[PDB]
Amino acid sequence: IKVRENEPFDVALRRFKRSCEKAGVLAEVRRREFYEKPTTERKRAKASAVK
Amino acid sequence: MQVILLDKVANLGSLGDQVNVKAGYARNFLVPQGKAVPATKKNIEFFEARRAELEAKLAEVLAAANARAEKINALETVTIASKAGDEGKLFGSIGTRDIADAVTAAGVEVAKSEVRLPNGVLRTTGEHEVSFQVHSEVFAKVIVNVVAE
C-alpha cells in the first residue's frame, strides 16, 4: 500500500499492490452484490483446492 | 448643511472651521453633543469677532512673554554675596529661588520657577551661567557671579 523506496532506483517496485487491494477486494465489491452464491462460488474454491 | 465646528472633530473638523456636513450627522450626533453648530450667519460673524481677538492680540502679548528676555541680556549679570572656603570655592551656593529671587528683586522680574540652573546648581565661586524661562521656546541666557564678600 505504501512504498518509501529511498535513493537509487526509478523502477516503481510496488508489487505490493498485487498482494491485497486492486482486483482483490475491488473486483469483488465492484458489482453484483452476491448474497448466497458466494457460498456456491467458494464451494468451488475448495471443490478445486482439495486437489 | 454648513455648520461651524466646536471641538477638533475627526476626519473633517478643525476646532472652529466652516465645514459642510450631512444633516443626519449634524442633528443626531454633532450639535447635540455640542461638537458643532448651525451656520446661521448670525453665528458665522459671532465667529468673525472670534477671528480677530484672542489670536492677533494675545500673541504679541507672548511677544511680551519673550521681550522680558530683551532685559535678560541687557544686564546679563547679578552677583550673589556668597564667600569661599579654602580656595575661591563658594562658602554659599545659589539655585532657582536664589537666581529667581535674586533676579526678581531688581528690575528683572521673573517667576521663581523660571530659572534653570541645571544643578551647578551649584558648587563653587565666580562666574557661572543659567537658562532663564518665560516662554516655551524663548528663554534666554545671563551670567551669574557669586561674589565672595
Binding site: - | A23, A26, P32, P38, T40
Partner: protein, 77 residues
Amino acid sequence: SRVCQVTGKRPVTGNNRSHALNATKRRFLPNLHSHRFWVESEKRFVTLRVSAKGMRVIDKKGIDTVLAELRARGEKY
C-alpha cells in the same frame, strides 16, 4: 392624527388621473415621522411628530424657536 407639529401639514385630497384621465379621489399624506430632539436648553428629549419638511424648519429656525412657537399657541410638547 397625521399632522406635522411644525408646519401643520396634514393630508390633502386630490385626484388620481389615469392615462384615460379618469379621476378617482385620493389623498396625499405628509412624510410624518416621530423624532426625538435634544433640547439643550432643557436637558431633555422632546419628541415631535414632524414632517421631513418639518425637520428642515427645525434645522434652520432651531428647536428652541420652533418649540417656542408650539408654546406660544399652547401646542403642548
